[PDB]
């Protein structure tokens, strides 16, 4: 609303955030069908980054890199997470959304 120049990029980023696949505790969706939608959404984020869609706004580019699970950018945002276990859950959300109980310790460590 405020920035007329950023409005096109805000619409792309709003659409990426809106389309992000979320797991629901009562869906008929299989973990495999979720993983395929999640991979396709991630390829849409990556295509927007590679096309330089956000190259005029470092903060929108950083948010798009966070959506890709970029570990360097997640670590640059350490101060917003304050704890390693918030960083763990953010990494699981953007790299490993179908994580098994048996794999949690490896990702936690």
């Amino acid at each position: 609303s405020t920035s007329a120049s950023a409005r096109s990029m805000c619409r792309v980023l709003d659409d990426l955030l809106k389309k992000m696949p979320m797991l629901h505790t009562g869906g008929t969706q299989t973990l495999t069908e979720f993983e395929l939608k999640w991979q396709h959404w991630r390829e849409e984020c990556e295509r927007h980054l590679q096309n330089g869609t956000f190259s005029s706004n470092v903060h929108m580019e950083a948010v798009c890199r966070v959506l890709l699970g970029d570990e360097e950018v997640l670590l640059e945002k350490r101060d917003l997470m304050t704890t390693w276990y918030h960083f763990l859950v953010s990494r699981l959300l953007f790299k490993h959304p179908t994580v098994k109980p048996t794999e949690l310790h490896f990702y936690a460590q």
């Binding site: 008929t28 969706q29 299989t30 495999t32 069908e33 939608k37 991979q39 991630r42």
Partner: protein, 558 residues
């Protein structure tokens, strides 16, 4: 007037209702937490009470108190124990009988539309999809053809124990898809996730070359689940936030199950059926007669379910008459080559990647029409024997008794012999009544599919030789691709659209279609409708399709 047994069942139910939640709590707790034998009998008691409970009070209590969820959740604990039973020397079979009683009770709950919804809410299909015991299919050792281990008669073979585990799970999946008519898409989506979780085992069942009764029952249930679950509309309305990568894998597995199910029509809908039924007549004359009837039923059920699947695929992909999915190639040659008595041509195993010919559907139609009369005559004779059992020769009573009790039929009373003979005759009547219903359904569905494919190929197919060479030169020139890179990610998978049909194929289809669907087959199909469809409320469907197909085959294209 109300039958005395239905009065006594109602009055008994009113007595169960007078003890209220106290009796429900004791039985449900003993079903979840009791000792092995107590759990089994409590689950069998719940199966029986829920079978007579028309008001669904016991089902409502079991859901609202969470016992239904505990019983479903405990399937994950059973998985660990059931895997140990697949070893060559299993522990005590107690866990198998508890699992059978639990699955029988869940199968009973799934028969009501409400109970199927409550089971989907408790996550039954999700817990079944997590069980690794289904992937532990025992390898059938083909080298046991050389004799001399009398397997001790008391412990079922590992393959038979694996079937006692797998068949109840498939029966629940098939029942939930059959009873859930208002939530059919969510039920189909969860059952699809189960089919994808165990996809190697499922493909191994669909590829199985064995003619055993157990392998045919596995195929009959699995084809009937795929016929109902693998509907094209289920993938587009699953609002389950699956990443694009997981939808492509899901479509890949479904497309494999599809090709394998269609390949079963070539195996069970053809002449190989007569050879599989004959190769087992030589190894044991005394145990063979019952297994033959059930193998014949399972083979017909496979053909029925794959034809139901073909029908469902044609109905859903056609919001408009111009967009028919073509499942069968326009060749009828396979129907004409199989009427010949030449026993010695080496098996051209058609690879599972070729679409079946329309000739397979006509051959299945001819065969089902012939089998219908044979089953009708045997059914009528068996009904006459059931009415006159006390007038049967003692040798026929002995043959009927030996089929239910191989050991000791000579030591039983005359009253017990007549009772065993009546039971065998009732099983025979009911099996033949189901074969008559399956033959009628296969005939209806074959006529529908034949009509739709003839309608498409004769009225709507554009032939590859119509129009026209006008403009543009450019020359050059041979050579070789080896290697190298680059991305373009717009592979829309709609590319099943290129079977180039020649004008010669359509003209051969018209000429072979008129010969293969002749007046003798048309008369038999009308005679079947007159004998069977007079008593069950579907008058005129076979006659209508026979008239439409006769219409299409008489159209000379102008």
């Amino acid at each position: 007037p109300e039958d005395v047994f239905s009065k006594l069942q109602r009055d008994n139910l009113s007595i169960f209702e007078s003890y209220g939640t106290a009796l429900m709590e004791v039985v449900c707790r003993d079903a979840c937490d009791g000792h092995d034998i107590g759990r089994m009998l409590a689950l069998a008691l719940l199966d029986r009470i829920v079978s007579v409970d028309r008001q669904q009070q016991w089902l409502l209590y079991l859901s609202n108190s969470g016992y239904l969820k505990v019983l479903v959740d405990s399937l994950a604990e059973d998985d660990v124990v059931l895997r140990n039973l697949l070893t060559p020397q299993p522990p005590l079979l107690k866990a198998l009988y508890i699992y059978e009683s639990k699955m029988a009770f869940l199968t009973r709950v799934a028969k009501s539309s409400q109970g199927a919804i409550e089971l989907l809410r408790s996550g039954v299909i999700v817990r079944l999809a997590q069980c690794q015991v289904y992937d532990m299919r025992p390898e059938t050792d083909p080298h046991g053809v050389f004799g001399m281990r009398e397997t001790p008669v008391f412990i079922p073979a590992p393959v038979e124990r694996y079937r006692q585990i797998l068949l109840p799970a498939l029966q629940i999946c098939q029942l939930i898809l059959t009873s859930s008519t208002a939530q059919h898409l969510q039920a189909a989506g969860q059952v699809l996730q189960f089919l994808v979780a165990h996809s190697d085992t499922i493909q191994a069942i669909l590829r199985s070359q064995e003619g055993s009764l157990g392998s045919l029952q596995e195929l009959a249930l699995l084809t009937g689940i795929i016929s109902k679950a693998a509907l094209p509309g289920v993938l587009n309305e699953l609002d389950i936030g699956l990443n694009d990568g997981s939808m492509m894998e899901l479509q890949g597995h479904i497309g494999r199950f599809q090709r394998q199910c269609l390949a079963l029509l070539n195996r069970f809908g053809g002449s190989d059926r007569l050879r599989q039924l004959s190769l087992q007549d030589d190894s044991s004359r005394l145990d063979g007669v019952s297994k033959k009837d059930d193998m014949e039923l399972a083979m017909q059920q496979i053909c029925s379910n794959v034809m139901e699947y073909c029908q469902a695929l044609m109905i859903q992909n056609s919001p408009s008459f111009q967009q028919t999915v073509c499942l069968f190639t326009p060749s009828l040659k396979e129907s004409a080559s199989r009427d010949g008595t030449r026993q010695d041509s080496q098996v051209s195993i058609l690879p599972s990647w070729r679409l079946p010919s329309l000739g397979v559907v006509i051959h299945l139609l001819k065969q089902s029409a012939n089998n219908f009369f044979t089953y009708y005559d045997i059914h009528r004779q068996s009904v006459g024997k059931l009415q006159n059992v006390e007038q049967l020769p003692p040798d026929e009573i002995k043959e009927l008794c030996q089929s239910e009790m191989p050991v000791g039929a000579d030591k039983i009373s005359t009253t017990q012999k007549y009772g065993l003979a009546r039971r065998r005759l009732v099983k025979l009547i009911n099996s033949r009544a189901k074969l008559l219903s399956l033959c009628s359904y296969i005939i209806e569905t074959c006529l529908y599919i034949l009509w739709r494919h003839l309608e498409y190929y004769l009225l709507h197919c554009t032939t590859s030789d119509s129009q026209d060479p006008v403009f543009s030169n450019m020359t050059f020139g041979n050579r070789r691709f080896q290697d190298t890179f680059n991305t373009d990610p717009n592979m829309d998978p709609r590319n099943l659209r290129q079977n180039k049909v020649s004008q010669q194929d359509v003209d051969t289809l018209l000429r072979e279609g008129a010969n293969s669907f002749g007046e003798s087959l048309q008369k038999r199909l009308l005679d079947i409708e007159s004998l069977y469809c007079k008593v069950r409320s579907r008058h005129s469907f076979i006659q209508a399709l026979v008239r439409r197909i006769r219409g299409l085959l008489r159209v000379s294209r102008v």
